[PDB]
């Protein structure tokens, strides 16, 4: 039994070992209680405003849309304390951990932004934080490893599997199944077992709420579409949620196409995988014919995951949201373009979203469209990665 629906159509559920079901039910119960607690909401709101810096700006691009009929705004989650949207829901989950009397935090991280958010919240709120990070990501997102450790978090390199995000997820969950009595698993995306996809959406939905109020103020109308990258689903569902019942507003999610979908080296299960059960949920995944989970690939550590959150699988199934893919090279071009023409250095994850919006504009330059891209993170963590690539390519 649960208080809330663990499913979105066919997708979702609580596919965890039996040992973890009480922890999940306890978390669901604490969440439902906190959502109707005015004191919790005031604490959460105060942290978001005075500590994390909400509301974030909505920036109109001045240059990259020149000569077209596209108006493009960027929702500036890159300006959030920590440097990405991850910080939003971490503040809420940290408060839930305290509410449940836990003093320890487990977290997975890929881009290191959820790890940094987990570490900063744990430092602030007096929790002992340990973070699993794939060994490949420890290298390609190294600035965030330094930030996490300076804030007193234990960072544990994961060498098994692809040594990337899915492998960190695996270890975090194995850890929790033995430490749940004292540790809260601060899952970093809108995926995994219920109640996480629901909690993470509700603790990220200020992104879309603010965006709506800001676009109404500046343009007097709703966007034609909002566009966000999809690694697990949290920044996209945070942007989407408040627009779902606004039927005229397109919801576009962007999966990583890696080296090209045709190469098999990508992270786009929603459009190119098939339904499976893994990481506590029934969801689209990259898997072999036999049902082994495949290793994903993206230039961006934050998108490099072979599955996706169940609410996105559902929104896609009913046609409410559309999902597309963007390759490494397309994301890199969007990265460069934003740096050089708007003076913003975006996360490579966010650059996938931007890349698709630039494609929407370039493909149909006389189409009148008002677009918002969720700029989920800043790109400081990526500058060394991008620099090395551009150098090995002349430039």
């Amino acid at each position: 039994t649960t208080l809330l629906n663990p499913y979105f159509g066919e997708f979702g559920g609580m596919y965890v070992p039996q040992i973890l079901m009480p922890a999940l039910n306890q978390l669901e119960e604490a969440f439902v209680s906190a959502q109707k607690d005015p004191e919790f909401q005031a604490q959460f709101a105060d942290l978001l405003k005075n500590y994390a810096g909400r509301p974030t700006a909505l920036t109109k691009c001045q240059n990259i849309t020149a000569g077209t009929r596209t108006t493009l705004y960027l929702k500036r989650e890159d300006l959030l304390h920590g440097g990405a949207h991850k910080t939003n829901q971490v503040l809420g989950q940290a408060l839930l951990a305290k509410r449940m009397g836990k003093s320890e935090i487990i977290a997975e991280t890929g881009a290191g932004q959820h790890g940094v958010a987990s570490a900063l919240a744990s430092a602030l709120l007096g929790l002992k934080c340990r973070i699993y990070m794939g060994a490949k990501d420890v290298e390609r997102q190294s600035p965030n490893v330094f930030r996490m450790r300076l804030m007193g978090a234990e960072v544990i390199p994961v060498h098994s599997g692809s040594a990337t995000l899915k492998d960190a997820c695996n270890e975090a969950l194995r850890d929790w199944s033995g430490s749940y009595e004292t540790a809260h698993y601060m899952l970093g995306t809108a995926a995994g077992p219920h109640p996480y996809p629901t909690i993470v959406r509700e603790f990220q939905r200020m992104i879309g709420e603010e965006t709506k109020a800001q676009i109404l103020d500046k343009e007097g109308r709703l966007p034609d579409a909002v566009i966000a990258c999809v690694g697990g689903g949290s920044n996209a569902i945070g942007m989407f949620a408040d627009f779902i019942n606004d039927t005229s507003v397109g919801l576009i999610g962007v999966e990583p196409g890696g080296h090209g979908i045709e190469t098999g080296e990508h992270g786009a299960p929603l459009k190119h995988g098939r339904v499976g059960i893994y990481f506590g949920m029934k969801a689209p995944m990259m898997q072999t014919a036999d049902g082994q989970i495949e290793e994903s690939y993206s230039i961006s550590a934050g998108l490099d995951f072979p599955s996706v959150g169940p609410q996105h699988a559902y929104l896609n199934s009913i046609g409410r949201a559309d999902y597309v893919s963007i390759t490494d090279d397309e994301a890199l071009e969007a990265f460069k373009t934003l740096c050089r023409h708007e003076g913003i250095i975006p996360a490579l994850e966010s650059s996938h979203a931007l890349a698709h919006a630039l494609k929407m504009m370039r493909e149909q330059p006389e189409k009148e469209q008002l677009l918002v891209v969720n700029l989920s993170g800043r790109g400081d963590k990526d500058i060394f990665t991008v620099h090395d690539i551009l150098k090995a390519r002349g430039e």
């Binding site: 609580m14 070992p17 040992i19 049902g291 989970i293």
Partner: protein
């Protein structure tokens, strides 16, 4: 599921607990795995718990993680596992065989088709590690339709509702989890909580086997003394495989000695 009923009836008649080793199918290779399993049986295993190699075994610690990896290195697939199971059943007509599965391997191309294949090769039970009773309906229904026992877990902090569900839904044997965490020999689980054992009996549950962290004969004896119908050991068995990869003969001799000692402890 009948092979378990006959086993436990026989064991009860002899005032004996069961000893049930776990190994990964195809670890370290198909032929050696088949020989390993023959040695487990000849050494006195009352039943088998057998893992189908899975890419992401989230209920398993490093020892059995690495068993899965060795099997994959040998190119082991679920189809080859079912080939092995046919061979095992052909040699050993009465021993109960349980599979340790992860959900995606069962769900992959049809739950019903999976349990049908199990029935065809003569498997007796299936434990799906990442399907709690709350998500179990299509799995246990398919299992029962194909005369397969679906195995469910009774954790240390199981409440009464869970005990009643596990007793009603499960067949063959009830898995009595020694402790939280993942599989691992180094992490020793506690004694069988007597209240759970007696409550399961009160609710007419399938006989309880204790598992996780059981790696010594002393623990097997304690499990049976506490009222459990037997004990399962995995990582302790797999560590012997891992230790002797270069010495196939020494591997089997050490497996035989270990299993013999573990089984003897179940007679206590």
């Amino acid at each position: 599921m009948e092979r378990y009923e006959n086993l436990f009836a026989q064991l009860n008649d002899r005032r004996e607990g069961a000893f049930v080793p776990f190994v990964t199918l195809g670890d370290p290779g198909i032929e050696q795995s088949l020989k390993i399993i023959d040695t487990l049986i000849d050494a006195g295993a009352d039943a088998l718990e057998l893992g189908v190699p899975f890419s992401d075994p989230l209920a398993d610690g490093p020892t059995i993680q690495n068993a899965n990896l060795r099997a994959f290195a040998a190119g082991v697939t679920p189809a080859q596992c079912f080939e092995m199971l046919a061979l095992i059943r052909e040699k050993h007509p009465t021993i109960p065989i349980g599979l340790l599965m992860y959900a995606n391997l069962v769900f992959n191309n049809g739950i019903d088709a999976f349990y049908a294949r199990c029935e065809q090769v003569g498997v007796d039970s299936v434990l799906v590690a990442d399907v709690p009773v709350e998500e179990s309906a299509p799995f246990r229904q398919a299992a029962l339709r194909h005369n397969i026992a679906p195995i469910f877990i009774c954790p240390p902090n199981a409440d009464d509702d869970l005990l009643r569900q596990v007793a009603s839904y499960g067949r063959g044997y009830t898995y009595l989890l020694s402790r939280s965490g993942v599989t691992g020999a180094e992490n020793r689980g506690a004694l069988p909580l007597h209240h759970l054992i007696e409550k399961l009996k009160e609710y007419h549950a399938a006989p309880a086997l204790q598992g996780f962290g059981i790696s010594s004969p002393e623990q097997v004896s304690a499990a049976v003394r506490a009222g459990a119908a037997g004990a399962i050991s995995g990582s302790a068995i797999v560590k012997i495989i891992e230790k002797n990869l270069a010495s196939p003969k020494q591997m089997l001799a050490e497996l035989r000695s270990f299993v013999s000692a573990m089984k003897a402890a179940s007679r206590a």
